[PDB]
Amino acid sequence: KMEAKIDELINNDPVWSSQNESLISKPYNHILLKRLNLIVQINRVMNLPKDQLAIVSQIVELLHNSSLLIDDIEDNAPLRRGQTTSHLIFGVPSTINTANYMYFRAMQLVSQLTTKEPLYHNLITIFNEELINLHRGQGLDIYWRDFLPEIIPTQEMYLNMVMNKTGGLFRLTLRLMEALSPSHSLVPFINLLGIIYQIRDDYLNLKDFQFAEDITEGKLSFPIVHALNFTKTKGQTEQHNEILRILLLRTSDKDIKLKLIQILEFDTNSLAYTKNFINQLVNMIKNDNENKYLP
Amino acid sequence: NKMEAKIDELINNDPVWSSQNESLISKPYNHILLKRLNLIVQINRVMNLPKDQLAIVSQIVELLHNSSLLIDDIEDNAPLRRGQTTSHLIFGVPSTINTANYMYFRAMQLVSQLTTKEPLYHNLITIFNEELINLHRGQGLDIYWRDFLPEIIPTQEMYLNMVMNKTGGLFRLTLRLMEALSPSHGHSLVPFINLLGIIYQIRDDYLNLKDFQGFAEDITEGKLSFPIVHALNFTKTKGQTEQHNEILRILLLRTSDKDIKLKLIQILEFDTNSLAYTKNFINQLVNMIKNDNENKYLP
Numbered sequence: 001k002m003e004a005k006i007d008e009l010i011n012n013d014p015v016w017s018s019q020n021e022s023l024i025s026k027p028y029n030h031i032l033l034k035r036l037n038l039i040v041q042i043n044r045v046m047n048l049p050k051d052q053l054a055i056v057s058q059i060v061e062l063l064h065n066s067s068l069l070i071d072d073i074e075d076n077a078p079l080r081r082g083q084t085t086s087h088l089i090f091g092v093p094s095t096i097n098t099a100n101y102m103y104f105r106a107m108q109l110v111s112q113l114t115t116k117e118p119l120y121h122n123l124i125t126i127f128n129e130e131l132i133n134l135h136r137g138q139g140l141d142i143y144w145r146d147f148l149p150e151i152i153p154t155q156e157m158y159l160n161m162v163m164n165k166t167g168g169l170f171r172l173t174l175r176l177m178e179a180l181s182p183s184h185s186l187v188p189f190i191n192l193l194g195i196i197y198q199i200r201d202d203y204l205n206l207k208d209f210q211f212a213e214d215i216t217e218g219k220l221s222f223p224i225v226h227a228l229n230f231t232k233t234k235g236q237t238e239q240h241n242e243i244l245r246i247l248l249l250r251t252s253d254k255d256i257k258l259k260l261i262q263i264l265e266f267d268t269n270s271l272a273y274t275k276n277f278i279n280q281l282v283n284m285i286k287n288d289n290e291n292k293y294l295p
Numbered sequence: 296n297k298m299e300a301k302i303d304e305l306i307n308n309d310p311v312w313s314s315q316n317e318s319l320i321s322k323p324y325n326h327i328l329l330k331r332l333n334l335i336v337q338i339n340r341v342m343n344l345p346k347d348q349l350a351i352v353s354q355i356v357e358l359l360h361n362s363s364l365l366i367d368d369i370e371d372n373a374p375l376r377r378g379q380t381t382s383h384l385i386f387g388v389p390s391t392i393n394t395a396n397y398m399y400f401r402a403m404q405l406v407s408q409l410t411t412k413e414p415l416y417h418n419l420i421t422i423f424n425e426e427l428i429n430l431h432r433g434q435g436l437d438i439y440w441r442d443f444l445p446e447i448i449p450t451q452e453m454y455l456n457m458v459m460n461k462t463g464g465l466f467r468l469t470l471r472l473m474e475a476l477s478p479s480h481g482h483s484l485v486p487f488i489n490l491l492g493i494i495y496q497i498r499d500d501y502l503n504l505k506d507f508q509g510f511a512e513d514i515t516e517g518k519l520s521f522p523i524v525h526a527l528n529f530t531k532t533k534g535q536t537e538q539h540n541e542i543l544r545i546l547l548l549r550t551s552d553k554d555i556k557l558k559l560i561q562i563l564e565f566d567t568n569s570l571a572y573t574k575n576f577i578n579q580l581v582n583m584i585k586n587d588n589e590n591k592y593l594p
């Protein structure tokens with residue numbers, strides 16, 4: 001009877017049940033109890049039909065939530081949107097696998113946006129290209145952090161890193177939408193929005209504390225990049241080294257975290273230099289009277 | 296206004312990526328390379344893809360398999376792979392996950408160098424997508440059963456389904472890509488490749504302990520391997536309560552103590568007779584192929 005069961009098995013597609021699907025989805029569902037608006041809004045110009053716009057939205061939602069699951073493991077984050085990160089509940093093993101599984105489920109949804117073989121290819125190429133960019137950006141962010149102080153990035157290296165890491169999903173959402181549109185490309189505008197988005201995230205992480213987790217993580221955030229480069233240039237060796245020492249401590253010590261922020265506030269004035277940089281990027285749009293970036 | 300021109304030149308160009316940066320993030324992958332082409336070569340005696348196309352299928356499968364291992368070793372807390380220190384322990388779990396995930400997309404990107412025919416490309420991508428989904432399903436079950444033990448004690452049937460997904464995934468991927476590219480051949484060889492993946496996994500599980508009675512790292516990992524699955528079901532079934540619980544206890548210690556690992560192996564050897572059951576089960580599967588004159592599995 002043994003041979004018979006093996007025969008049945010190898011001749012059928014692999015078995016997968018609804019219950020199993022549930023087991024593997026747990027780390028993902030956990031983060032769901034936590035961007036669409038932007039798609040809505042941009043559609044007032046792309047006017048994709050609603051059921052197709054929904055799939056796009058579902059694809060962006062899978063990639064985004066899955067990327068955070070992985071990012072929190074990569075950043076040793078204890079919290080995300082006020083709750084315990086999934087890896088601390090389901091373990092790093094299941095969370096990595098679930099997140100990665102969701103990347104491929106998102107991919108499968110791509111083949112359901114169209115049956116037109118020419119267009120499908122483009123949708124897949126876009127998906128593939130931006131996922132590649134996302135990992136390149138994320139890899140560099142991680143590399144600088146984990147090899148510190150081997151390489152201290154410049155503002156320009158940081159901006160290119162951000163174009164990959166944060167612009168990736170913004171560009172993916174948008175490029176899909178433009179290729180599907182039944183009706184000037186908006187990628188430049190979405191690139192700039194991604195950059196603004198990331199620098200703002202980096203700024204707020206320190207400003208709402210002054211958790212300041214970026215310090216505990218030892219992240220080469222926009223203000224840290226500024227401060228490190230500012231002290232190096234003004235030959236303020238000791239402050240330069242003090243910033244590195246605190247980042248390398250990977251500390252959760254509130255007093256130490258505060259010490260580093262005061263360095264950026266009083267010494268380099270990096271927080272105020274960032275605030276101004278963000279405003280300078282937003283003004284590039286507030287003053288886009290020629291509508292060169294805006295629609 | 297120069298910063299503005301700078302911001303303007305950037306957002307209006309593709310993101311910048313150097314070969315230097317490509318090397319820096321490829322470290323985890325390059326390390327595992329220092330450690331498959333035969334089975335592809337044989338099957339091609341049947342499929343006959345031109346050599347240049349067969350070399351791309353090969354690079355794809357090589358990228359997926361290697362990246363798969365990088366990830367698997369993090370998931371299994373493995374200190375060694377092919378006799379060498381695991382990449383996550385050298386470059387860290389963060390870079391290793393990211394790099395392995397990056398290589399999954401590099402592999403996907405290669406699917407396009409295989410054809411210029413749109414209908415076929417679409418099929419190659421679907422196969423790629425399908426089996427990667429299958430791989431993650433099996434791997435997800437292997438991991439859940441282990442980290443949540445004893446929430447679920449898988450039966451022999453459940454383990455085989457998990458392995459059909461987990462190990463048979465890459466085998467089927469490679470074969471389905473080749474069958475779809477073949478310009479040449481008979482009944483699909485999928486059932487045979489499924490059997491090969493199943494025999495392959497059970498052998499991996501078996502050897503992992505028989506070579507200790509290697510370092511029986513599957514025990515330290517707490518893996519619901521084929522012999523362990525037999526032992527846990529056999530004990531429940533035979534009323535060996537204390538033994539059933541002791542198997543669970545050892546698995547949950549995640550121990551590196553060789554005597555404790557050795558006690559467990561001898562429990563499988565003399566008490567549940569799981570090692571012999573597995574050896575014989577392997578033979579019986581191998582016998583389904585060898586005793587195949589009507590070629591219902593083999594080409």
Ligand SMILES: CC(C)=CCC/C(C)=C/CC/C(C)=C/CSP(=O)(O)OP(=O)(O)O
Binds near residue numbers: 169
């Ligand atoms: C599927 C997909 C989009 C990408 C795949 C590769 C990955 C994981 C990219 C990272 C994407 C994200 C959310 C980056 C922000 S890290 P951060 O600096 O924002 O850390 P934080 O958001 O502040 O916690």
Ligand SMILES: CC(C)=CCC/C(C)=C/CC/C(C)=C/CSP(=O)(O)OP(=O)(O)O
Binds near residue numbers: 363
């Ligand atoms: C991209 C791809 C191929 C798969 C994606 C999903 C993954 C990571 C599947 C895992 C497949 C492998 C190599 C498992 C080995 S654990 P084991 O029980 O086989 O023991 P081992 O470490 O291999 O000896």
Ligand SMILES: C=C(C)CCOP(=O)(O)OP(=O)(O)O
Binds near residue numbers: 081197201
């Ligand atoms: C990964 C970064 C930098 C932010 C992504 O969007 P948000 O994280 O700010 O939005 P939600 O996940 O809270 O929905």
Ligand SMILES: C=C(C)CCOP(=O)(O)OP(=O)(O)O
Binds near residue numbers: 377462496499
């Ligand atoms: C169960 C899996 C996937 C690994 C088994 O050994 P491999 O066939 O992977 O051997 P090498 O990759 O080390 O050559």
Ligand SMILES: [Mg+2]
Binds near residue numbers: 075
């Ligand atoms: Mg993070």
Ligand SMILES: [Mg+2]
Binds near residue numbers: 071074075141
């Ligand atoms: Mg991060």
Ligand SMILES: [Mg+2]
Binds near residue numbers: 367368371373
């Ligand atoms: Mg393993």
Ligand SMILES: [Mg+2]
Binds near residue numbers: 437
């Ligand atoms: Mg494993």
